[PDB]
Paper text:
The viral genome is encapsidated in a sheath of oligomerized copies of the nucleoprotein N, forming a ribonucleoprotein complex termed nucleocapsid. The nucleocapsid is the template for transcription and replication by L, which is also dependent on the obligate polymerase cofactor, the phosphoprotein P, together forming the active L/P holoenzyme. In oligomerized and RNA-bound N (N-RNA) the nucleic acid is threaded along an extended groove in between the NTDs and CTDs of laterally connected N protomers. An important function of the C-terminal domain of P in nsNSVs is to bind to assembled N-RNA, forming an N-RNA/P complex.
Upon recombinant expression, N is known to take up host RNA and self-assemble into oligomers. Template-free 2D-classification of particles revealed that the sample contains primarily rings with 10 protomers. We obtained a 3.1 Å resolution map of 10-mer rings of N-RNA, a significant improvement from the previously reported crystallographic 10-mer at 4.2 Å33. We observed that the overall map quality was slightly better in the CTD region of N than in the NTD region, hinting at a degree of conformational heterogeneity in the NTD. we also determined a map of the 11-mer ring at 3.3 Å resolution. The 11-mer of N-RNA possesses a diameter of ~188 Å, slightly larger than the 10-mer at ~180 Å. The ring expansion by one protomer is accompanied by a slightly increased angle between neighboring N copies in the 11-mer: 73.6° in the 11-mer vs 72.0° in the 10-mer, in respect to the center of the rings. Thresholding of the map at a low level indicates the presence of additional N protomers, however, this density was too diffuse to fit more copies of N, presumably due to heterogeneity of the sample or conformational heterogeneity. It is notable that in this arrangement the RNA strand is obscured by N protomers belonging to the next turn of the assembly, suggesting that a conformational change is necessary for the genome to become accessible to L/P. Taking together our cryo-EM reconstructions, we observe that the lateral interaction of RNA-bound N protomers can support a range of geometries, demonstrating the plasticity of N-RNA and supporting the notion of a highly flexible HMPV nucleocapsid.
Numbering used by the authors:
A (entry chain A), B (entry chain A): 3 to 99, 112 to 365
Write the structure that this text describes.
RNA sequence: CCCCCCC
RNA sequence: CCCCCCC
RNA sequence: CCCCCCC
């Protein structure tokens, strides 16, 4: 009975990876970028969104992506979009009287944001004593990263739902971005997060662009505190869409007794197959659900209901499960694992 | 008695694989493709099938395959058809006044579908408040993938019968494609599935084309949620036509006691030969029955009636057998294995 | 189909 | 988010 | 001959 072995998942991944033909999508579409020579101007825009109370926050995400394009460069951004499987033709950004003319972003919107910000600045300078510090002004060099930090907060919740994503973004940005909120008292995290979620859902190649910025930022030798915060949040998104695997390795670390049942031990083989596929893909496996790589779903543990039920029960026992919305297929294993997990958490045993 | 060994199955596969002559079929036949430059138009057609209630859904499968041809490209599609063992001459697609002239698809049909869809859109715009969202319109970019998702649902049931295939397609598409059904309330999954089943049976080289699209989609770096769903369904088709091998590895994982009988232990040698042949073919072994590769049938376990009966009994005991229509040759082994499988399922043993 | 918590 | 002492 | 279930 040693030879009765199939290895289906490795074969599926081998089929998906070994393709001699490249897909082509978004052939007739275009997107906007801004060259690095305009970074000092786009920073202003990315900051002129933050300290004023704007009626429409619709294209804030596009301005954050514009700053990313200034950071990497226009040619590198076109190359990134091309290697992301999307045949989008980059459209460059121009200036006019100065202000920016970003493609697909109406000049009325940019003018409205700039005018609202100028009026707010004049009002806060006229009434107050005219002692605006260097960090409270729109031309601060970390304002684009503060906007991209809200974007990165909503990036970590792209596997989740829209409403859960917005609530988590607001809750976490009131604390993660407390200093920016103090510097810019009137920044509407809900609307900016909504804009970023809309951008990430509509233009999926910008997820790849956004990921490339994270790499280009994490590999840098120096950075401000805003960029370090952005990288911290960006890395919090790494295992997005695959929390079941993380809870499985947690259960294995917990030495759950219900892991030794007959059905769990029956499915452990294909479970180890899923983990081997994770290792096979390597570093980019974590970014599969963030990118909406169609290859995602090879890492699903839905084909092991007893293992999934035991792991969710262990998570519920440790209190980790929180408000996870997954299904528990086998309730008896879930409850038994929960009981053991509570017993282990409550008990204090030292070796 | 160590040398009394034959290895017939390896020899049969060696004969089949090591052929110096290539077959030629469909020599005088032609098929239609659409170049990528028309993708933005074909998308419309692939979506103009979905939100209107059409009398004839006869060539919907050809429109899905046309979108696949736009995605891969005309030259790559001709090459795919050539390497699939079929000498079909590709015929390109043209436009006229705009609409498409697909070869083998009557222009009356295309005009009828377009006119029905335009009339339905006008009716739903005139009566309603004229607030059609961006996902409910025919020009949505995931509509071709929604049609190909119905096609992929009927693709997983190509080893099954036509009626079972259509019933499963409707049942699964009311749930898998619930969001598309909400977006397009009036999409007739039965008729579209019938069209796709007819296409897959008549033109078998389009199975190879359809498989190539799955690879070109699974290997992509990014994709929409529709394409991820399509790849999920496409991978659900992987072991099609070979569920007996999957249930055999399930039985081995279950540690069924009836595996140790004399006749089961007698046939385990050639059973392991079948599994070794699976490993020998490698990743493409799963796609043999989907492709109707004549080499399929080397993976049949019909020459091991006692092993097949024990495995089917184990499956019936675990409740996995469902409504499987295979034959049980040896009823005593089937019943004994079923009894042990029920006993193991009912019993909760933890190591 | 998949995903779904907290940081 | 992270960091946080003494030398 | 083979295939045949569910997701």
């Amino acid at each position: 009975l040693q030879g009765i072995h199939l290895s289906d998942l490795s074969y599926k991944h081998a089929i998906l990876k070994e393709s001699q033909y490249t897909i082509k999508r978004d052939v007739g579409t275009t997107t906007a970028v801004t060259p690095s020579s305009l970074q000092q101007e786009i920073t202003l825009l990315c900051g002129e969104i933050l300290y004023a109370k704007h009626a429409d926050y619709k294209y804030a995400a596009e301005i954050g992506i514009q700053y990313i394009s200034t950071a990497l460069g226009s040619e590198r951004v076109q190359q990134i979009l091309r290697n992301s499987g999307s045949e989008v033709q980059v459209v460059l950004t121009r200036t006019y009287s100065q202000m920016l003319d970003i493609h697909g972003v109406e000049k009325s919107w940019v003018e409205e944001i700039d005018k609202e910000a100028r009026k707010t600045m004049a009002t806060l300078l006229k009434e107050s004593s005219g002692n605006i510090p260097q960090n409270q002004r729109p031309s601060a060099p970390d304002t684009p990263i503060i906007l991209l930090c809200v974007g990165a907060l909503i990036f970590t919740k792209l596997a989740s739902t829209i409403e859960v994503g917005l609530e988590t973004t607001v809750r976490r940005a009131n604390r993660v971005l407390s200093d920016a909120l103090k510097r810019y008292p009137r920044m509407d995290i809900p609307k900016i997060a909504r804009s970023f979620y809309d951008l990430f859902e509509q233009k999926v190649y910008h997820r790849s662009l956004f990921i490339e910025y994270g790499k280009a930022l994490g590999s840098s030798s120096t950075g401000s505190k805003a960029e370090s915060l952005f990288v911290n949040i960006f890395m919090q998104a790494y295992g997005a869409g695959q929390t079941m695997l993380r809870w499985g390795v947690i259960a294995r670390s917990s030495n759950n007794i219900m892991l030794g049942h007959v059905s769990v031990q029956a499915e452990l083989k294909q479970v180890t197959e899923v983990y081997d596929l994770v290792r096979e893909m390597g570093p980019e496996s974590g970014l599969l659900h963030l990118r909406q790589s169609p290859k995602a779903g090879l890492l699903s543990l839905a084909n092991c209901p007893n293992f999934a039920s035991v792991v969710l029960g262990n998570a519920s026992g440790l209190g980790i499960i929180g408000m996870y919305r997954g299904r528990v297929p086998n309730t008896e294993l879930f409850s038994a694992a929960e009981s053991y997990a509570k017993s282990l958490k409550e008990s204090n045993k030292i070796n």
